[PDB]
Amino acid sequence: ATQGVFTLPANTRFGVTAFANSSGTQTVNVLVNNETAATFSGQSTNNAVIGTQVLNSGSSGKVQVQVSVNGRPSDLVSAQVILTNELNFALVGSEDGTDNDYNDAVVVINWPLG
Amino acid sequence: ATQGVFTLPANTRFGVTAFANSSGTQTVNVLVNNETAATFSGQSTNNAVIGTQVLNSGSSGKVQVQVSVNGRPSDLVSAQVILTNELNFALVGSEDGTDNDYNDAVVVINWPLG
Amino acid sequence: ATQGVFTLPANTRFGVTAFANSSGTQTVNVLVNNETAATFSGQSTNNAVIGTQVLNSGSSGKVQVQVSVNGRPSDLVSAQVILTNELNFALVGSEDGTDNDYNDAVVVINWPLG
Amino acid sequence: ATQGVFTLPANTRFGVTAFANSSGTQTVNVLVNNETAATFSGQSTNNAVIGTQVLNSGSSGKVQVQVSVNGRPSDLVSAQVILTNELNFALVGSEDGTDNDYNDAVVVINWPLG
Amino acid sequence: XWXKXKXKXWX
Amino acid sequence: XWXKXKXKXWX
Amino acid sequence: XWXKXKXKXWX
Ligand SMILES: *C(=O)C[C@@H]1O[C@@H](C)[C@@H](O)[C@@H](O)[C@@H]1O
Ligand SMILES: *C(=O)C[C@@H]1O[C@@H](C)[C@@H](O)[C@@H](O)[C@@H]1O
Ligand SMILES: *C(=O)C[C@@H]1O[C@@H](C)[C@@H](O)[C@@H](O)[C@@H]1O
Ligand SMILES: *Cc1ccccc1C*
Ligand SMILES: *Cc1ccccc1C*
Ligand SMILES: *Cc1ccccc1C*
Ligand SMILES: [Ca+2]
Ligand SMILES: [Ca+2]
Ligand SMILES: [Ca+2]
Ligand SMILES: [Ca+2]
Ligand SMILES: [Ca+2]
Ligand SMILES: [Ca+2]
Ligand SMILES: [Ca+2]
Ligand SMILES: [Ca+2]
């Protein structure tokens, strides 16, 4: 199944944050309406925050997270969770190798803000 | 029901990261085995990261998140989500006022690391 | 925080199913737009299904689950999870006593159907 | 990533329930420690319960859900969610066709029971 | 499922 | 409730 | 927080 694609409420500000846990440099692309809106790049085996940004979900609300290492797409896992019918998390893990820890890049999207 | 309390695997390193979306300064305490192990303090209405830290869940694995604003405890909401039976997120929202956006401090715990 | 309240897409059919795990007879009421739309009652300590039904979320989309035992409201916990940006679960647990297993009535709402 | 595999606490009773939303006849197989422990089959486009059963997770705790139609494995999506650090849901959706609703068989595993 | 109708897709 | 296990036998 | 300009109306 497709992973890393989320329909947010349209025209809504949201946060996106990436963490790295791999020997390889993680490239995290965040697409809004199928166009790149943010890119984070970094390497850590200690869960470092390699980037964080506030974006707008635009007219479609479509947000997609892609993760690659040196141009090679990682395998993604994802889900959205909503707490008290208000607070939204869209969550992505990714695997760049063979150990299947799925933490090589971890991406958290959250909304609403403010 | 109790919120903000999670049983992690014992003796395991985990990330904790907090974001702020409120006029008031957020204080985020993370307790491991009932003893304070991390405190973050900061203020933002635009999802700024107010802290990120790798901690050890210790012999009990018990991790508790508390949030307060100038001493007053915020109301918490939380859940744990596991993707592909490997990647764990413990998620906390918190409400310091009356509008029930539950984003005033947002806390993400993730494991495993590395 | 409020629990057991979910905003579904309007005018959408959804499933609601309740299971019991308690000595007490569970009464599960499902409200749509603030009016009772289904009521299940039953007793089991073995996860028996005490009711399942298809309902329409109506013009507002607002669905609320209430649980009581012998007329006393149980304490609720809840969250919504979305898989592959398509498949929705609204999940409720409830506690009628002191052991905090929160399984005394378990209610699963799922959509879309068909 | 692998989907439909969950590590439960060992030696623990759990409920498993399957719902159907497809023109195709669904067969859901539940494996405990790699051995078939329950099988449900049925056909509904109205979320009918095609099976519910109580099983024990055994010495390994490994539970796997498989879904097929006419002998062809459906594509699975899954996640586990824990509420108030106590109430667990292991959730599976499945797709037998091309519309990507992922509800063709929906499987809910819940624990603890009793 | 197979054929034409609601939800049928390629089947 | 009251009795055995997780609270069975009364009520 | 209190007053105007802190979310949506009161609170
Ligand atoms: C075959 O018809 C496809 C199948 O059944 C449809 C009624 C719909 O439920 C679709 O999601 C499913 O794959
Ligand atoms: C007493 O009735 C408590 C009640 O029933 C028990 C069998 C157990 O399920 C407990 O969780 C529940 O609150
Ligand atoms: C007042 O401090 C309330 C507080 O700050 C607002 C800007 C808004 O974020 C609100 O949700 C928060 O509780
Ligand atoms: C009805 C059906 C079952 C399995 C695979 C394909 C199709 C059309
Ligand atoms: C002990 C018990 C359990 C459930 C309902 C009533 C009573 C007295
Ligand atoms: C800002 C705040 C804090 C606590 C209670 C009420 C309000 C408006
Ligand atoms: Ca890896
Ligand atoms: Ca890794
Ligand atoms: Ca607030
Ligand atoms: Ca806020
Ligand atoms: Ca109970
Ligand atoms: Ca119980
Ligand atoms: Ca389908
Ligand atoms: Ca379907």
Side-chain angles (χ1 to χ4, degrees), chain A residues 114, chain B residues 21-24 45 95-99 101 103-104, chain G residues 1-2 6-7 11:
Chain B
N21 293 277
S22 173
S23 181
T45 62
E95 177 54 49
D96 67 14
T98 59
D99 69 354
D101 66 359
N103 70 359
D104 299 322
Chain G
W2 307 115
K6 293 180 189 167

Short mmCIF file of all heavy atoms in Angstrom, two decimals, chain A residues 114, chain B residues 21-24 45 95-99 101 103-104, chain G residues 1-2 6-7 11, ligand 3:
data_model
loop_
_atom_site.label_atom_id
_atom_site.label_comp_id
_atom_site.label_asym_id
_atom_site.label_seq_id
_atom_site.Cartn_x
_atom_site.Cartn_y
_atom_site.Cartn_z
N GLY A 114 -0.35 26.83 16.63
CA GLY A 114 -0.80 28.12 17.14
C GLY A 114 -1.42 28.09 18.51
O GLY A 114 -1.85 27.03 19.05
N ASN B 21 3.09 25.54 21.12
CA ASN B 21 2.08 26.28 20.36
C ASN B 21 1.16 26.98 21.36
O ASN B 21 0.00 26.66 21.51
CB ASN B 21 1.24 25.37 19.47
CG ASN B 21 2.03 24.78 18.35
OD1 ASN B 21 2.24 25.42 17.31
ND2 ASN B 21 2.48 23.52 18.52
N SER B 22 1.67 28.02 22.03
CA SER B 22 0.91 28.68 23.08
C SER B 22 1.59 30.00 23.42
O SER B 22 2.82 30.12 23.35
CB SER B 22 0.91 27.81 24.34
OG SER B 22 0.31 28.52 25.42
N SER B 23 0.77 30.95 23.91
CA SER B 23 1.34 32.19 24.42
C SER B 23 2.20 31.97 25.66
O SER B 23 3.10 32.76 25.92
CB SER B 23 0.18 33.11 24.70
OG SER B 23 0.65 34.36 25.18
N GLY B 24 1.91 30.94 26.48
CA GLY B 24 2.66 30.74 27.72
C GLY B 24 3.90 29.88 27.56
O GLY B 24 3.95 29.01 26.69
N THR B 45 4.36 30.13 19.52
CA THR B 45 3.05 29.88 18.94
C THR B 45 3.16 29.34 17.53
O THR B 45 2.17 29.31 16.80
CB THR B 45 2.10 31.09 18.95
OG1 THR B 45 2.66 32.16 18.16
CG2 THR B 45 1.91 31.59 20.38
N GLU B 95 -3.04 20.76 27.06
CA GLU B 95 -3.90 21.93 26.99
C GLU B 95 -3.68 22.75 28.24
O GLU B 95 -3.97 22.30 29.35
CB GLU B 95 -5.37 21.52 26.90
CG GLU B 95 -6.32 22.71 26.91
CD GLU B 95 -5.96 23.70 25.81
OE1 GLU B 95 -5.77 23.30 24.64
OE2 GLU B 95 -5.86 24.93 26.08
N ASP B 96 -3.17 23.98 28.06
CA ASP B 96 -2.86 24.89 29.16
C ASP B 96 -3.96 25.90 29.41
O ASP B 96 -3.83 26.74 30.34
CB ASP B 96 -1.50 25.60 28.94
CG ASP B 96 -1.49 26.57 27.76
OD1 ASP B 96 -2.53 26.91 27.25
OD2 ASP B 96 -0.37 26.95 27.38
N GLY B 97 -5.01 25.87 28.62
CA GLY B 97 -6.08 26.85 28.75
C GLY B 97 -7.44 26.21 28.57
O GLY B 97 -7.70 25.13 29.13
N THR B 98 -8.30 26.84 27.76
CA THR B 98 -9.67 26.44 27.56
C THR B 98 -10.03 26.13 26.12
O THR B 98 -11.13 25.63 25.87
CB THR B 98 -10.62 27.54 28.06
OG1 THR B 98 -10.33 28.73 27.32
CG2 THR B 98 -10.42 27.81 29.57
N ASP B 99 -9.16 26.42 25.15
CA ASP B 99 -9.61 26.27 23.77
C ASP B 99 -9.53 24.85 23.25
O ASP B 99 -10.03 24.57 22.16
CB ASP B 99 -8.90 27.26 22.82
CG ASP B 99 -7.44 26.96 22.62
OD1 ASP B 99 -6.91 26.05 23.29
OD2 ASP B 99 -6.80 27.65 21.78
N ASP B 101 -7.31 23.01 21.90
CA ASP B 101 -6.47 22.58 20.77
C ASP B 101 -5.46 21.51 21.15
O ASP B 101 -5.02 20.75 20.26
CB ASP B 101 -5.87 23.76 19.97
CG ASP B 101 -4.88 24.60 20.74
OD1 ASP B 101 -4.60 24.34 21.93
OD2 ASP B 101 -4.39 25.54 20.06
N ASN B 103 -2.43 21.44 21.70
CA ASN B 103 -1.13 21.50 21.04
C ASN B 103 -0.16 22.40 21.78
O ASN B 103 0.91 22.74 21.24
CB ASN B 103 -1.25 22.00 19.59
CG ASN B 103 -1.62 23.47 19.54
OD1 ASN B 103 -1.80 24.10 20.56
ND2 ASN B 103 -1.78 24.01 18.34
N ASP B 104 -0.49 22.79 23.02
CA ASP B 104 0.23 23.89 23.65
C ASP B 104 1.65 23.49 23.94
O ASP B 104 2.58 24.28 23.68
CB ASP B 104 -0.54 24.32 24.89
CG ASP B 104 -1.93 24.79 24.55
OD1 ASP B 104 -2.15 25.48 23.48
OD2 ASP B 104 -2.89 24.50 25.31
N UNK G 1 -4.11 32.51 26.78
CA UNK G 1 -3.72 33.66 27.58
C UNK G 1 -4.93 34.59 27.54
O UNK G 1 -5.92 34.32 26.93
CB UNK G 1 -3.31 33.29 29.04
N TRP G 2 -4.77 35.74 28.21
CA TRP G 2 -5.89 36.66 28.40
C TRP G 2 -5.92 37.77 27.34
O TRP G 2 -4.87 38.16 26.79
CB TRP G 2 -5.84 37.31 29.79
CG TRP G 2 -5.72 36.31 30.92
CD1 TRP G 2 -4.67 36.17 31.77
CD2 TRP G 2 -6.68 35.33 31.29
NE1 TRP G 2 -4.92 35.16 32.69
CE2 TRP G 2 -6.15 34.64 32.40
CE3 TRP G 2 -7.94 35.00 30.81
CZ2 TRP G 2 -6.85 33.59 33.02
CZ3 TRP G 2 -8.63 33.95 31.44
CH2 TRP G 2 -8.08 33.27 32.52
N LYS G 6 -4.93 36.01 20.93
CA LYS G 6 -4.29 34.80 21.44
C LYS G 6 -5.11 33.54 21.14
O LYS G 6 -5.52 32.78 22.02
CB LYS G 6 -4.02 34.93 22.93
CG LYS G 6 -2.98 35.99 23.28
CD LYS G 6 -2.74 36.07 24.74
CE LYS G 6 -1.87 37.28 25.05
NZ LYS G 6 -1.89 37.52 26.49
N UNK G 7 -5.28 33.28 19.86
CA UNK G 7 -6.03 32.11 19.44
C UNK G 7 -7.28 32.60 18.75
O UNK G 7 -7.21 33.52 17.93
CB UNK G 7 -5.17 31.19 18.58
N UNK G 11 -9.83 33.03 25.40
CA UNK G 11 -9.01 31.88 25.79
C UNK G 11 -7.83 31.76 24.82
O UNK G 11 -6.94 30.96 25.02
CB UNK G 11 -8.53 32.09 27.22
C1 LIG H 3 -3.20 31.61 26.47
O1 LIG H 3 -2.05 31.60 26.83
C2 LIG H 3 -3.80 30.41 25.73
C3 LIG H 3 -2.80 29.69 24.89
O2 LIG H 3 -2.07 30.46 23.92
C4 LIG H 3 -2.87 30.76 22.77
C5 LIG H 3 -2.00 31.61 21.81
C6 LIG H 3 -3.37 29.47 22.06
O3 LIG H 3 -2.22 28.72 21.57
C7 LIG H 3 -4.06 28.60 23.09
O4 LIG H 3 -4.36 27.32 22.43
C8 LIG H 3 -3.19 28.34 24.28
O5 LIG H 3 -3.95 27.53 25.23
#
